Each structure stands twice: as C-alpha cells, then as structure tokens.
Symmetry: C4
Subunit: 388 residues, 4 copies
C-alpha cells in the first residue's frame, strides 16, 4: 500500500448527485442511536466512513437533556462506514469535542481535542496508536476543522485555531507524518479569522475554504504549500457569499482580500472549490438561519471579485427544513479527483423546543459529470414523534 498523492486532475462536474443519507433522527424515535453533532465524511482508498462528535449518550435517554452544549468530557469521535447509523456498536475512536480525520493511503490519522476550555490538549492518533500531542497555545478553546484533513505523499496537514471567537486569534497549520508533528506554520496572508476549514487536495498543494467568525460573511481561503510549508490566505471572490448570517444577494460583497464587514460576526462551517475561474459552492438557503441548503456554480466566482452570475443551482434541502454544518471530501476516481460534500441536518434545540436534546442526521452528495434532476432530502423526523 502506497501513500496517496492526489496527483490527478479534478473531475469536470456539471453538478452533484445523491450519494448517502443516514436517517439518524427518524431512527432514534424507535431504537438506540447516538446523539451527535459536527459530522463529516472521509474515505480510505477503498470505502467511505462517516464521523461525528458523540455526546456520550443515546437520544432516548435522560442524558440527552441539554446536549446543545458544545464541549463536555464525554464527547468522543464516532466512526462507522458511510450509511451505517450511529448505533450502540459504533466505535468511539478517541476523546474529542473537536476533531479531524484523514487517511494517508496506509493508515488513518485522527486529530482529537478535549479537556478544559483554557487548557485543552490535541491528541494525534495514527494507525491505532497515540503518536503525538500538543497543548493549547492561546488558552482559549483550541479547535480544528471538523472535517477531513488531507495527506500528500505521507505528509498530512491540518488547520487549528486557538483564541477569540470574535476577534484576532492564533491560527496554525500543522504538518504531520505518521502521526508525528514535523512542522508548524503560522497563518499568513490577508484572512483575519479562520475556523473550521473545509480542505481538499489540489496537487501539489492543499486548499481550504473556512469560516470567518469575526468580520466576514465571505469565506476565507487558505493555501498550503506542502513542499516548503509556506502559507497564504485571502477570501473567496464570489459576491454570492457562503457564510450564515450574511446580507441578501443584492447587497452582499467580497473583494477577495478582506472580510466584507457584512453581518460578519458568527457563522457556520461551509465549503467551496475552484474550477478554473469558476467556483462551486454550497450555502444555507436562509441568509440568517441554518435553514435549507443549496449548491451552485458561480461564473468567475474564483477569479472575479464580486461576481454574482450563478448557474446549475440545486436544492439539497428545502428552506422549510433545518440544515447546519457542511463540508467537502475528495474521492479518487480512475482518472480524476472528484469532490463530494455532506450536509449536517440539525434537529432539536435551540430551534425546536418541544425536545430537550440537540442532534443531527446527514445527507451526502457527490460530484457528477452526468445529468440529474431535482429533489429535497431533509432530516425527515417528526418532532412531535420524538422522545423529549
């Protein structure tokens, strides 16, 4: 088994096709299913796996009460094959209220953060054993991507932040070989706040589309050079911005360089990727709440500041239903690298107060060069049918 290089051209895509759905919440109403949030997807050379941060409890369980909270010692990283719901036989891979995972072609790497808010620790698990760890450097919620990291030629990269959620923070990019941290580069460039990066291989380098939780409703971009460890950053050009909250389409802006200062505070994990001058992206349909989900291509969305010409829109989740986090993952095909994405479908608190828990299911789509129709694939659970 050889290290992955991802050295194939990116697949030409016309849009995305349905790939997977786990129906977690619907199942939780009649079965023992983990309470989760912050899910993602990543694949080894053979097959795909779904991940999520458990809350150390199932849903029909009094411990599900008040699981809206982000960080407790009982959160662990869950790992199943894609499409296998998080049942009681699910393996907890490590202790984590923040995590990232990727396969280098030989074995799995897991980056897992847990512990006190002011003094967290990140554990690096490779091939089933703990190889390294690092402590918080800003004493303010060390946190990472909540989606797959990416490895090229045996070196994996992952983006971590420590510091304010609403002000300048300390972002660093780690380079890891077989679980061992070999280099750390400070964030550099014009991005002013970085969280929860959705990264993908763009041989010879790596590209990440992130969340600015401070001043921008446009998404920061981070470029990682795997040859000399240099870092660059900026913002997605598209005038159709990908964060939530954000201004409506007629009054939103991006100049590619700075945060737009348009409803910039707060945000949601999301993704996008470049194709020449064009940009493929997803976003919530609602501009102020984590509701609905849509994807489209923006003409000149990568190269032209403020471009708002859109095409090939697809509704993934209609605006009558809740969404949440979303992220990218890459799949090596026979001749090219395909891009896929997942959408987190959050149910319960704070939006739905009949119940006392917070959880999610997922829906997953993959890039296609073929054709496709329309639909809507929401969580699908009836809140009135749920254990409270």
């Amino acid at each position: 088994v050889e290290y992955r290089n991802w050295s194939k051209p990116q697949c030409q895509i016309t849009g995305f096709a349905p790939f997977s759905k786990d129906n977690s919440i619907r199942l939780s109403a009649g079965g023992d299913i983990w309470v989760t949030r912050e899910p993602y997807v990543s694949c080894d050379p053979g097959k795909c796996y779904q991940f999520a941060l458990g809350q150390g409890t199932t849903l029909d369980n009094k411990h599900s009460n008040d699981t809206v909270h982000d960080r407790i010692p009982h959160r662990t990283l869950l790992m199943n094959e894609l499409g296998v719901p998080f049942h009681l036989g699910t393996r907890q891979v490590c202790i984590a209220w923040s995590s990232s995972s990727c396969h280098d072609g030989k074995a799995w790497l897991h980056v897992c953060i847990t512990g006190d808010d002011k003094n967290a620790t990140a554990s690096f698990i490779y091939d089933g054993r703990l190889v390294d760890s690092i402590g918080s450097w800003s004493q303010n919620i060390l946190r990472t991507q909540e989606s797959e990291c990416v490895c090229i030629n045996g070196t994996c990269t992952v983006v971590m932040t420590d510091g304010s959620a609403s002000g300048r923070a300390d972002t660093r990019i780690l380079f890891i070989e077989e679980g061992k941290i070999v280099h750390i580069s400070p964030l550099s460039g014009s991005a002013q706040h970085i969280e929860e990066c959705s990264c993908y291989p763009r041989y010879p380098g790596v590209r990440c589309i992130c969340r600015d939780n401070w001043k921008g409703s446009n998404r920061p971009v981070v470029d990682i050079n795997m040859e000399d460890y240099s870092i660059d950053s900026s913002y997605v050009c598209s005038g159709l911005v990908g964060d939530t909250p954000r201004n409506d389409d007629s009054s939103s802006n991006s100049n590619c360089r700075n945060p737009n200062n348009e409803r910039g505070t707060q945000g949601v994990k999301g993704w996008a990727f470049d194709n020449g001058n064009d940009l493929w992206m997803g976003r919530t349909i609602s501009k102020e709440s984590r509701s609905g989900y849509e994807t489209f291509k923006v003409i000149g969305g990568w190269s032209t500041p403020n471009s708002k010409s859109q095409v090939n829109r697809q509704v993934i989740v209609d605006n009558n239903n809740w969404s949440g986090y979303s992220g990218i993952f890459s799949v090596e095909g026979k001749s090219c690298i395909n891009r896929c994405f997942y959408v987190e479908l959050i149910r319960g608190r704070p939006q739905e107060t009949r119940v006392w828990w917070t959880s999610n299911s997922i829906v997953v789509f993959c890039g296609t060069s073929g054709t496709y129709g329309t639909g809507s694939w929401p969580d699908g659970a009836n809140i009135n049918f749920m254990p409270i």
Copy 2:
C-alpha cells in the same frame, strides 16, 4: 479477481429447495427492525446478500405510520448478508426509492433512483464511489428493476423505464462499465410495456422477464445482446400467465408476441426462466391479489404459444398468507449456473388495517437437481401481536 462471464451451462433442475428466511416482521414485534419493501437478492462470487428499500424508520416507531407510500426522500437501499435481519447495524448503501445491484466479479454496482417524481435522478455507484448519473428522460417516475442487474466480462446491463404506468412509456437498456454508462439502447421488439425486470445471465447474452402494467397479464420478455447492444422483446409463451391480476387458467392466453388484454392493467414484479422448450415460473396463487405463491414447470411453456400443461408444482406460500414481489438471481456452481428466487412477504396496509405500517419479510429458494417434499413458509407474524 476476474470479471464474471457466467459462461457455464444452466443447472438442470427438478424444482426448488428451501434456502433462506429472515422472519423480519415476527422479530419487529420484539426488537428494532427496519421497515422495508421491494427486497431482492444478489451474490458476489463468495456469498449472498439481501437488499431492500428502507422507509427511513424502524417498525416499532411512530414514523412507521403511513409507510404504504412508494416514494419519499428518506428511502435508502439496505444491504446485509443473506439471513441477517435488517437491524440498526444495517448499512444504507445509497438514497433510493427504486434500485438495482450486481457484482461484476470485482466490485458491487448499485443503481439508485431518488428525487421528485417528474425530475428524478439515477446515481451509479461502483466500488464504493459515485461514477455516473442520469436525469429523468420522460419526467414521469424514472424507475428500474428492483432486483439484481447482470454483468458479463466487466459490462453490466440494467433496464430502466420512464413514463406512464398505464400507457406507452420510454424504456431503455443501459450498459455500464465500472460505474460508467457506455451505451444506451432503446427498447425494441413487440413488448408494449416494461417494468421491474427480473434478469439473468444466459451466455453470451442476458434475458429478462418483466411486468407489463398496461395491457398484459402475460409477462414481457426482453433479450439483451451484450456484444452489439441490440435489444429484442416479446412475451412469455405459457398460457399459464404469471402476472397478478390475471384471468383464471381456463380463460388465460398468451400468443408469445402481444399483451393478452386480459386484466392487463396493474401487475406485480415476477420471474420465469427457460429450459429448452420448457418454462420454470412462479406466480401468486390468487389471481386477483398478492396472496400465496407457487412455482411450477410449464411443458412447452417457452416455445409453444398458449401451452397449459404444468408439472413439478410447489407451494412456497399457501393461499392463506400474503406474498408480494418476487425475483430471480443466479448462483455460479462448480460446473453450472443455478437459478434461485426470492419472494417478498408483505404485511400491513393496505390488506391489514389493524396496523398503520407496511413492511415485508422474505423467503428464498434455490434450484435443485435432487429431490424435495412439501411445505409452506409464510411471513408468520401475528398481526394482533404487532405494534400498530
């Protein structure tokens, strides 16, 4: 591992022997089991797997209410080893309210259809990744076999229809290599309506026995040439017809060429296969409802129009019990290719209204050249013992 060729003679059979039963409904009264319908069986070179379309819920679950409906966004293709009930550890292979699966000798292909009725999308998944997709071509419920597709020398074939359920439709035959559509041939021949084909390898080609939902209670036949992609079609000769509804044996007819216009509208997925001039087939015992199941050989049933001389009858499910869909699958033996079949055993609505759900279990038989006795292997659940 090499591609399958299925280039062996068909096993000479004297009838069928008991092979498997999953007892799904009985187990649902005391455990968490998926609500399903439209099951089928397919085998890789090593072992058999049962498939079914989930309803995104377990049975003892308020979400099981009103699952009689055919198409919702939450339906997914379930896949287990044959004989493992669909418990919560079951993998959802893809999003689908219509599907087909087959193994080409190296990897699994799954064809999955989901989305809006008027604008559905079919996804083609091969070796665990999305390789292709196609959109609806007649904007009227794109739909496929609900049983195994078949592959010869790395090329898999699958029958898809789009259009009217009770009128002329648009049926196409797809040829797929490693998930990629390489050719599409329109239906051709004298079959006037084609749905839910049960196909089997008949080297060098593929033969399908289908469901005519429009004018025929006789079953359409589709012949697929894998070498030049040419298609031919007709109807099964046997005057003992295999659809439901149908006329009784004394007044049923087939001329091998046209639909018989005998209680032709509506129908049920079924199967049959040729052996020289003779025909092996299954059918519901009841001529008007999906009740009971029987198999038998029709002498001259393949070659002689309107033949009604039957032999080697076996009751599979007695007429006091509900059946449903049925389909064929092929298993490669040491010297020959065996033919097996599964029967869907539908419980709940519309027939049993004490409960609000609709689900099924299955029973499976395989061709034998030995001897056998008699019996009846129904679902066996007591409707009064079920969660409503």
Copy 3:
C-alpha cells in the same frame, strides 16, 4: 487451504475444563435475544461457532408464546462465533427445524431440514450455496443430528433418520462432497433405533454416539467407514448408561449389543467417546428428568459389558438446575485431536410454567490434560425476573 483429515491421535485427557457460556436467558430479560433450542458447537480450523435452531422470534416478544413446539416453518439455523449471544445481528444460515453443520477445511457444510412432517426436505448448503437436496423417504419427520457432522479428506458424513419415534425407523448415512450427496448407506448392525447422533472423527473413520428413543436407555453406537461406506452399529458397553430416562445405577444394564429395555422409551441427545478400553461420557444427574449434568470416565466402559467402575467425575450443572441436550465436538491441536462438549440449558415450559416460552442457553467444556477443580455453571436466570 487443505481438507481436514483429523489424522492425529486423540488427546489424553484427565477431565474437562470450562471453555464458554453464553448467558442467553439472563440477557433475554434485558435485551432482544433469539428464542432457541437444539444448540451445538462446531469449529473451522481457526475458531469455534455456536449454532442453534431459532424459533423465528425473540424472547421478549409475544411470538415467544408456545415455542415449546418442535417444528414450525419459521425455525432457522442460527450461527455466531462461540460466546456471541444470539442477538438481532445473528445470521440465519438456512430454514431448519433440524440440522447439522461441519467444516471440511475449505468451507462450511450445512444440512437443513424443514417443511411438512410427512414430506420434509433436506437442503445441503456448501460454501454459501445450495448444492443438493433430498426428500423424506419414510414420510415421517425426516431428522438429523442436531450437532456437528464430520469430514475426512473432503468427504463429510451425516446421519439421518425418517420414521417412527417409538418403533423401527429408517436410518441412513449420507456421504457428501462439496455439498453433493455421493453415496447413501443404510444403517447396519445391532442398533435398533437411532436419533440425534453425536459424532466425532476417529481416523480413518467416524464414530457416533446416539439416542435410542424406543427400547434402550443405553446409547447406540454407529461406526462409519469412510473408505468403503460400510456401516456397523451396537451399544455402549458401560453399565452406567447415558440416556434419560433410565434406571438408577444399581439396576441399569448394557450388553453392548441390544437395547436394554430399561425405561427405554423416550430419551435425550447425549454423547460419549472411547479411550482404549475406557469411556468418557456425560449425562443428566437425574435419572428421569433433564436436570443437572455430570461427566466421568468409566473404567472398561468401552470394552467391558456392564462395567460400572467410575472415576474422575465432574459436576457441570448441579441437580437443582435444568439441563437438556448435550453433544460433542472435536478441535485439532498441534499434535492431537481434543474432544469438547456443550450442554443445552433449557428454561421455560414444560418445566417452568410462570412463562409461556421455551428457550435455552449453553455452557461449553473442553478436554484437558492438565488439572482442575469443581463448580457448577447453570443457566442462572431467575424465572421470576423473566418476561412471561
């Protein structure tokens, strides 16, 4: 992978040591566990599996009512790794209300009987596919071993009976190669009634200790010659007889040749094996009911008619607790063949009427050349804690 030959001397044992226990009934009171009976154990070259005949239902399930009955269409053969309880993820290997399984060194053989009492069918499944089948020859409950069959050099042998439970019956020995019946020999010798044989490899042949349900409380012996298919039979010499019911130790007899006509009617599956002139055997402690279980060595028990000198007794289940069926299995060690046995621990009806179901757990012991102490390992469930 090569065929098993079992061509090593038998291990010299001083008794038996604890090997496994599944705690099924205890777990059934707080989880979804199959209702079973007629368990057995068989190992492939790597690891052991437990088998049982399910009743198509879990215990905490209204369908468990009246599962005292031996034969319904919903009984299937269950197969798990030894020590894994029969939970909802258990694979149902085939339809069976009577069965036998064994591994020839390359793949598993399963012999499964189901259908009408007067016209049953036996299916032979090898390497996950149906290879052969045979119908009832006496039209009176075709039935087999309910424990492992044994294979030498690619040929497996299994003992089947069809006919009266309380009179002369028609017993046949089948020889099966890769699932294909290659020869059938009639029972021969002086054994007058044969049921439920516990067989073991005794290179170059196979030896079975069985149940006489008609005239003997002494156990019949069947000797199977794998080279020329010839059969011989007689009775265990030991004056300490292994069946239940039976006379007490001071008035029980055996002449090695004929049934003893001592409370000979009815019986229970049991086992024994020769070591030179001596005999290792197990039996219920009670002489009239399936209560308790003990093993011991009888000096001259194999060669000397009516020998009653016992040594190395071990209590497996104390007489205050229910037992049931028991059987042998053989495990190839580095230099020798070891013998092990399991005991079925039956709970519920007819003996315990607070509940309406009948089920079992198991305990398993293996021969040892080392030393050991004492104990008692019963089912352990509190009938008052059980779902009725």
Copy 4:
C-alpha cells in the same frame, strides 16, 4: 507473522494524553449494555481491545440486582475493540471471574479462572482453543492479574495467587508457550503479598507493579527473568505510595524492601513504571476511598527510598468522581515502546445506593513526548437518571 520481542527502548514521556473513553454507564441508561467490572486494555500488533468481566446480565435488567459480588458462575470475559461499548453483540471469550489476556504476535492467550472459591480452575486458551488448565493449589480463591500479561519471543508470563487475602499466600509465576504451561516459578524476594499485578515488557525481562492486600500501602514490585525463569521482588521506592487506602503524603513511607505497615490491609489494583531513577505512577486522589485519579512523576521515585519530590502531575478524574482499578499496557511504536494506562470508573454499589447494581466505564490515556493541558474525564452518568 513473528513473535513480539518488545526489544525497543522505552519512549521518553513528558506525561499522558487522552486516548479513549467508552461512556458505558451513560449509554446503559438508554440501551442494552453489559454490567461489568475489572476492565483492562491490551493490543495486538494492529489495534487495541478493551476487556472486562461481565456479570452475565445487562444493566437495565432485573438480573443486575446485587452485582456487587465478585464471583458467580455467570461471569465471562468480554472482549471488544477499544472504544466499542459492551453491547449485546460483544463476544464472551471464556468463563471467568478473574482473568488475564495478551497477544504474542501470532495469537491471543486468555487466562480464565472460574468455579468454587476453594477449588477453582484456570483455563488457558490460545488461538481460540483450550490448551491447558490448572487447579487451585491453596484452595482459597485462585486469582490472577485483571490486566494484560506479556509475551517475549513466544513465551508469555502471568502472575497468579492462591491463598489468604489478609495473610501470607502462595504466589506463582507461570510461563506459557502457545497456551501450554512450560514452567512455574514460586514467588521470590521481599514482597510479602502479591495480587493483581500490572506487568510490562522491559526487555529482556518483564516487570510488574502489584497490590499488597496485607501489610503495605506501598506497591510490590515483581521482576521476571524470561531467560532462566528466576524471580525477584521488592517494593516501589517512592514515599508517595500508590495503594488505597494509604497514609497522607506527609506520613507515608517506603524503604523499597518491606511493606510499610501503613494502612496496609486491603487495597486496589494500580500501576507504575520506571524511567532511569525516576518513576511514573497513578493513584486515586482520595487516600481512603476509590475516588478521583491522578498521575505524576516521582523524581528518584524508582531508585531513592522514600523520595517525595513530585512533578508533571495530571488530574485524570477529579476527586468529586468515583474511580477504581487501574492498570498498564504497552504499545509498540516505530522506534520505541510506549506506556499507556486505563482507569476503571465504578458506579453503583456500595457507594451509590439509589441503584442495586454495580458496574463501570473506563477512560484511557497514553504516554506522550509532546505537550498537553488539563481536564477531568469521569464516568459522567447521573445516578438519578439510571434504571435501579
């Protein structure tokens, strides 16, 4: 596959990082989970497994009542991949109320003790078959490590004791090759009472840190020579002693040679390991009860009698939360052997009398050469939310 030699230097560590947590009790409140105690962790060359002694029942189950008791016939050794909770699909590896497991590089060895207090039997299972067994030698609760044994070059060593819990007993060290006992050495040296050793490879030998239940609150040390089977023993030098109960830090003593006679009676399983003259160890935070858990390094703690200079302390479980047993396990890295430990988190009786059961979850940490922060990772279950 080759035998393990553990012939690499010990990893230089700065402390420990979070590795795993199973949340068993929290999950038991909403799911079917085994009642357990005496857990441990051990790894094959590829992955880690968690073990525990089941009580033959799940938690939400009337049979969970009064599971505070240490020894019943229904206790079995449970084995899952690390991070997989003990659900109903868990394999019971053997019958045991005391056990030890390890992998020699080729296969698993399991040492399982069960039976009467005064006449117990230890079974030795290697590669899935029983190879040896030994009976009680002092007729007073034969017992072993309750943590992993260790194997060097095909020979595994395990420490067993039989006799008084509060007086001189008979401790022996067994050397086992492929399940077969090849030598037995009596304990030797100055350690006066030995129980529940936590052993680790220290090439060319094996070192164990144990529990003195009679006269010492300082932990005994057992040194095992794998080449000539010679044994030596003593006590840990550190004046900061590791047992519970124990004196507080200002009046606790150890002279390296004798039990300290400081609250020596009773105790708890624990661990420690040497690095040059220094010592890494864990212990409960409370000095009289199994509450809280902490780790630290004692400068000169291995070589200097009564040393009390501590550094690199970490809280694992805060003193508001219950702990219990703990033990070491070793993981082979690319260049070095790392040391890890697990902590048993006991909930229920005798400490929490609202419920009638006794069970545990676990948390697991591994040695790191990196950095880390702080936290607390207790069981986390709310006793008021539990089935009683």
